[PDB]
Amino acid sequence: MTIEELKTRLHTEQSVCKTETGIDQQKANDVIEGNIDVEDKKVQLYCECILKNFNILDKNNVFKPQGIKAVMELLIDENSVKQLVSDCSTISEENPHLKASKLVQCVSKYKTMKSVDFL
16 A cells, blocks of 8 residues: 555545444544543544444454554654554553544554555
C-alpha cells in the first residue's frame, strides 16, 4: 500500500461508514480529527465500521495486531507500532461498539486519520 492509496482507502471507508451509521458529518469529522466521543452511540458504530472494514477488529471483536500493523506501518515507525499494539490491546470491553470507539481513540493518540492527509 502507497500513501496515496491509503489516503483514498481511508476517505472511502470514512464515507462508507458515515452512510451506514447515519452519523452527523461534524461528529464523523471530530473522529477523523482525533477527538473521539467514546460514549456517543453513532461515534461507536462509525468507529466499529472503520476498524472492521480495515480488519483491525475481527468478527470476534478482537483487536488484530496484523490488521493494525498493515495500516500503521506506512504512517508510524516499528517502535511506535509496537507501543500502539501493546497499549491498545489492553482495552477490554464487553460492549463491542464501546470497544470500537475506545480502540479508535487509542490508535488516534499515535496518528489521527486526519494527519494521514498531511503526508
